[PDB]
Design a protein around this ligand. Structure first.
Ligand SMILES: [Cl-]
Ligand SMILES: [Cl-]
Ligand SMILES: [Cl-]
Ligand SMILES: [Cl-]
Lengths: 172, 172, 172, 172
């Protein structure tokens, strides 16, 4: 490559794996969104919450791929595994599965940041700091806030609480 | 007729029967709307939901009648039977009765579409496709969404759930 | 299902397979776009042409999934195979591969339309007619137009022709 | 100094050397720009490309000098060597010489970042991350893109390709 400078093969490969993780996460959120659009589930605010996360994860993949090209690495795409479930249970089940997913993405970001630090790749480290690490902290805090509110609403009237959360917390 | 072309007597008669079904449906929704306006029922959002459907069904009759004349058929009106009930129970009862009604209208549309196909009447088939079939699919999906939300809200506090649904889902 | 009416299991399954085809096509176009963004390829108009098609194919998947739910079918997601190539050759190679891809999607649309016709499912048939069949004819005609212009430009100065096509036909 | 804190003599000296490198780079780009303004070269877009880089490199020197004072170091200026050539050949020769120059500046930035890291100087490290490292990656990617387009245009009509690149890629 005519432009590549200070860009390790280890980082290049890890960036391609992270793209696969982000596209997998977008696919998971596409499935979560359409589950909540089912006539027998019918929680529009939950559907919109996940549809917006699907778009954000797709765009994170796009940012990584643009950066891969800016550094002179080579995008390599692998098969995308389907999401882990076909039906996602309650809003509480879904929000728990989303937090597990985001913590897995955050660990992948932190691992890549540590590789970049070890490789003395400050552009890579800055890039994750500027566009990914704080977005992930903010999203996980918001999901944690939502989990607490959902859990407070279960009581012994689970249906009522799930309706009220979707109506009064989620955007619709 | 000076304009009639490719318009079977079978379709003409079926269009007149469908007009009767739509006007019957408008009458049913007029009754449902005024029931929810009773001082002893008093669910304004439910009243407005049905009043708007009464208007839409009246206008579907109008579209069919305009088309009958555009094709050179003859509008023929029959007696309009009263609605099936004088009192409509809970919002849940009413929304169940509305879904039954819409599925009966949708089957009548599909039956007429199949007659038009058998008669090689593509204008009739297009006309139903363009102004009726998707509107019915969309309305039935919305009613199904509403049924699921109403059912989630019953729990063991039926009054509270019926108030909250009317206040937080239906327009008022 | 409380809403499903006139919606065959055969159509439901074929719609889920078509969603997989559209998401595969979006993935193919994501790969084509990032290939043309490589510093050693560097054809911005070609990159933008494919990036826009990736978005359109993603949105076709979304329309199909929304319709699946409107009809009371169940979205089921499968693994997404990676694109057929890692490197896409010349603009001419890429545009040939895109036409092959679009004709495969168009055949899948026509096959699903024929199943819907056989199943007397006019809503499905209308849905494909209204949102997919003409978009595919228009796109294939545009790709054919582009292929002819690219082929005229090869001559014995292939580099010059590929630059001029990207500069004077494609949006940048 | 009344303000200096955590600012090593090693960093102070390296910042003064980097200022000299940036001012040398500005001077190189001033020479490249005026070469392309010669009546016997006459490539206005190439002239404007280099004139804009001369201004950007001057301003990078300014940012470094402002930072040196903000940290309580002392600006020290050395002689500025003339550019490496008096005549710069073809646009291709010039763009190759520019990429070599930018990679030399990028290595100097990465070296200074590594010194700051070793000295536990996070303000210096942040400063380079925020104002220099990504600008250099973006510029090198753009130059690489331009090199590829220039190389595609040489064919066996070098004059025609150099005209077309200047007319259709570079701003004028
Ligand atoms: Cl899997
Ligand atoms: Cl009666
Ligand atoms: Cl494969
Ligand atoms: Cl010298």
């Amino acid at each position: 490559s005519q432009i590549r400078q200070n860009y390790s093969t280890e980082v290049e490969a890890a960036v391609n794996r992270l793209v696969n993780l982000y596209l997998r996460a977008s696919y998971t959120y596409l499935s979560l969104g359409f589950y909540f659009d089912r006539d027998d589930v019918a929680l529009e605010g939950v559907c919109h919450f996940f549809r917006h996360l699907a778009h954000h994860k797709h765009h994170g993949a796009h940012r990584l791929l643009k950066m891969q090209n800016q550094r002179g690495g080579r995008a390599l795409f692998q098969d995308l595994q389907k999401p882990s479930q076909d039906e996602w249970g309650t809003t509480l089940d879904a929000m728990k599965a989303a937090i597990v997913l985001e913590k897995s993405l955050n660990q992948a970001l932190l691992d890549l940041h540590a590789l970049g630090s070890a490789q003395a790749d400050p552009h890579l480290c800055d890039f994750l700091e500027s566009h990914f690490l704080d977005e992930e902290v903010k999203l996980i805090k918001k999901m944690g806030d939502h989990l607490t509110n959902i859990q407070r609403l279960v009581g012994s009237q689970a249906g009522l609480g799930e309706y009220l959360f979707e109506r009064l917390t989620l955007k619709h």
